[PDB]
Amino acid sequence: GLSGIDLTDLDNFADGFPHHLFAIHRREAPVYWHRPTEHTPDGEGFWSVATYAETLEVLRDPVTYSSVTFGGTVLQDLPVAGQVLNMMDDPRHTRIRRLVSSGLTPRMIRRVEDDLRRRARGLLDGVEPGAPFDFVVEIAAELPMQMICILLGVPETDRHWLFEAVEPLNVEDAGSRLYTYALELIAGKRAEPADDMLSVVANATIDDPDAPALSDAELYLFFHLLFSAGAETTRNSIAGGLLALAENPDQLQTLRSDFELLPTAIEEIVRWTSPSPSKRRTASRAVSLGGQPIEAGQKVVVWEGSANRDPSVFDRADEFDITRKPNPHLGFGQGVHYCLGANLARLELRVLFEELLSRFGSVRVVEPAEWTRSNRHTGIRHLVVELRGG
Ligand code: HEM
Ligand SMILES: CC(=O)N1CCN(c2ccc(OC[C@H]3CO[C@](Cn4ccnc4)(c4ccc(Cl)cc4Cl)O3)cc2)CC1
């Protein structure tokens, strides 16, 4: 069973989150030492955590399970190793998280909502009914990218040009373009503050020596990482949502008939899709997790993607149900690092599906979904659909 399963082998992730591997994991060893293979980061083994109770226990103890432990086009050769908020512990984490939260202003969130609703309408009004198209390419990717650019204060004219560097053309040039751009943007917001999250965070000076404000290079890292990954997780929830609804047409009809069902439906979409299905932590001290001793310094990987289908907590865990109650999913994390984007993601999903379902009661997926090759993101690269009134 587990002894021949390699969770670092991305071939196991190329076709979607491998739920069947995680059923084995939960049954055989909730908490398991995963020896390093040819495919494993740093040739370092780790504790792999697949059940809900133990995953939640790790998330809820940031003192024992430290978040101090980048792909894409992110610059790999900066002179200094910056931190990003999700890799911080207290005291610095608390101060920076509070700062980022203070950047999520009501006026800016209204701007996102208005822009989303306009764009969602524009895009859906442009669909040719019944004609196949790639939902990811034409709609799902666009809306969160615009949201994340509004949040980070990126002028509209620069957004797709930036998205090309974030998601390509070579890695060096991409990263260099983004670093220059980010640093110009930061400089501009310091000279003329704007009502956006990046401006608030960039303009901060903190007097605690153990909790300094973000450096310029750290602000670039934050910009790049959140742009890429906040856009990606959100689009994956949208695309995976459409797919789940298309595979359960009776629920689609129920939902489209009563938008008061949408908030609960959105929680089930996040549970089902679990776009960010794994996290790293490092044990800071000897401790036991589910009766397994762990030593200080050892890596821990929790799998929310597995926890969210744990049959000890979710009845009929392997079925999608838009009316699921209760639904204590971990799709947005839990504890001190809980997703600061959770309401933003849910807004994206709510507006898109309201606009989509108002117009189309028939959703057909006409080619197999193509999944991205990753165990850090569960995502759909292409989803070819036909939308009709129905
Ligand atoms: C459906 C889309 C999204 C999903 C599934 C998701 C998931 C998550 C999860 C599971 C965590 C916890 C990380 C950890 O425990 O180490 C997290 C953290 C975070 N999320 Fe998201 N996220 C989504 C969208 C967004 C968006 C749109 C934003 C933009 C504000 C955002 C901003 C953040 C930030 C800043 C953190 C780190 C918080 C901290 O470390 O204190 N996320 N997200
Ligand atoms: C060896 C092994 O088995 N494995 C390798 C390493 N593995 C892994 C590595 C990194 C990782 O990263 C998740 C954390 C970091 O990523 C985000 C994604 N995100 C973005 C917005 N909301 C969530 C994030 C949050 C805030 C900000 Cl500022 C920026 C980001 Cl990138 O959460 C998740 C998993 C898991 C699989």
Author numbering: 6 to 74, 80 to 178, 193 to 414
Copy text from the publication:
Among these is CYP126A1, a P450 with ∼35% amino acid identity to the cholesterol-oxidizing M. tuberculosis CYP142A1 and CYP125A1. However, CYP126A1 is highly conserved across pathogenic and non-pathogenic Mycobacterium species, suggesting an important evolutionary role for the protein. In conclusion, we present the first biochemical and structural studies of the M. tuberculosis P450 CYP126A1, revealing novel substrates and inhibitors for the enzyme, defining its relatively polar active site and its ability to adapt structurally to facilitate the binding of bulky ligands. The CYP126A1 structures reveal a dynamic molecule, with the BC and FG regions clearly affected by ligand binding.
